[PDB]
Ligand binder design. Structure first.
Ligand SMILES: N[C@H](CO)Cc1c[nH]c[nH+]1
Ligand SMILES: N[C@H](CO)Cc1c[nH]c[nH+]1
Ligand SMILES: [Cl-]
Ligand SMILES: [Cl-]
Lengths: 259, 259
């Protein structure tokens, strides 16, 4: 069953990537391609998921929870295009995110960059892979040595901005720009810390098996389990995320955030 | 002669890309690959340039001006890896920059992304191309509608920070992260404005023919010609750059910068 879930997840990603490639870089003139692409890619992923698993649920931004039954043990939580600003501006560092949750816990995550043809797959029980090769996070001696990413300086509001700044000022260097891709880099051992505020569950659940299966750590800003039980009544509110390659760095970050 | 300059520039870029690909993503463990790569790639570019053009000069960050004669009409100004933070962190949006200057004016520029296999070529007299296909900037109705990039919020010091903020607050959205790649996106019509402070000449001269040959505008923050006459005594100081797809946007930006 678990290899069947992986095979179907890969089929979904293959379909989404062809759709997305059709619309990327079409907008260089003075519904938009990104909206069509998101919708069409989601439909292509859902269609193959539900053909293979009619008892499963799906969850996406626009349509919410959908299931032919009142309830489901298995829920696919999808974002065809995480990083729509990158997509719209022609930058190939957006990703397609696919998570499969069993009783609310992610058991499979994919980060797919269809232009670069890079696919990270996290599966509970397995080491994370990139294009079929195992990857690992790296150690990092101290927060002062850590390479930090976040999408944008402007995506922190209120007290979260002050907390971010506390961590930001302590790392080796803060870098910006690319949504889920930074977490993929962390999982491959090229980034030490990612700290973001205001992620919806379809933009973080796929990250969890990827990072954890690479040896990293990902929690909310209090260090609690990042969790969202997709259900008919779950609310897609936004969460604060901190991911690290090294658990000691993670703790240092938590101590600076003071959330 | 001009097609010979283009052929040799492409040979140089082909050599640099193979060198860089050898060292990219080797640093996922707990002289570095980026330093070796930069040095080796520069040497590979210089070696083919000077074999083809022994009367020419070359200019690079580490070695400065080099020429077998006291003077040269033609000077190649190179940066093997613009975006070393991206390179070090495994992000494939650094670029190799090659500029050829005749009497101090760029006549050829290349932006090469060797992982993505994307090459923008600007040649005076020709429309800019990406992988051999002509590209163009796009129009933009007003600064309020403009997509803006800059590498980092932290790369503005002093009065330049205040000037940046004046423009930043007026655009549709400010985005971050990727060095020369944003200028390539502008030249292809996917970005409207790029505003940066503190670029060395080896990181902007190649941009000029690329952007101008796409229909865009690139100047210093006073709207003056961005120029650096590479010579035995030229100082590689840093410059402020503003590039736009549309000349009306460019003017609006200048008016906000108030430099
Ligand atoms: N990838 C996320 C959704 O586009 C970016 C983000 C960061 N913080 C809040 N939102
Ligand atoms: N690509 C440039 C050199 O890495 C980035 C930069 C922006 N402003 C100052 N420096
Ligand atoms: Cl089923
Ligand atoms: Cl010669």
């Amino acid at each position: 069953q678990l290899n069947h879930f992986s095979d179907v997840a890969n089929k979904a990603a293959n379909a989404a990537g062809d759709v997305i490639r059709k619309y990327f870089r079409k907008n260089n003139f003075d519904l938009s391609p990104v909206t069509i692409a998101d919708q069409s890619a989601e439909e292509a992923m859902v269609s193959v998921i539900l053909d293979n698993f009619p008892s499963h649920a799906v969850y996406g931004e626009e349509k919410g929870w959908r299931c032919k039954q009142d309830s489901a043990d298995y829920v696919w939580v999808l974002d065809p295009i995480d990083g729509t600003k990158s997509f719209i501006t022609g930058k190939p560092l957006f990703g397609t995110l696919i998570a499969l949750l069993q009783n609310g816990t992610p058991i499979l995550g994919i980060i797919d960059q269809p232009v670069l043809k890079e696919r990270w797959i996290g599966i509970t029980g397995k080491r994370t892979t990139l294009n079929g090769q195992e990857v690992s996070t790296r150690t990092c001696a101290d927060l002062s040595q850590a390479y930090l990413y976040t999408t944008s300086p402007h995506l922190f509001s209120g007290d979260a901005e002050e907390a971010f700044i506390r961590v930001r000022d302590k790392v080796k260097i803060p870098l910006y720009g690319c949504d889920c891709y930074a977490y993929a880099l962390l999982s491959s051992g090229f980034v030490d810390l990612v700290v973001e505020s205001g992620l919806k569950p379809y933009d973080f659940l796929a990250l969890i098996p990827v990072i954890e299966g690479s040896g990293g750590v990902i929690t909310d800003w209090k260090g609690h389990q990042l969790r969202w039980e997709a259900s008919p009544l779950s609310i897609a509110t936004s969460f604060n995320v901190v991911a690290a390659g090294d658990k000691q760095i993670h703790q240092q970050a938590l101590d600076s955030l003071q959330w």
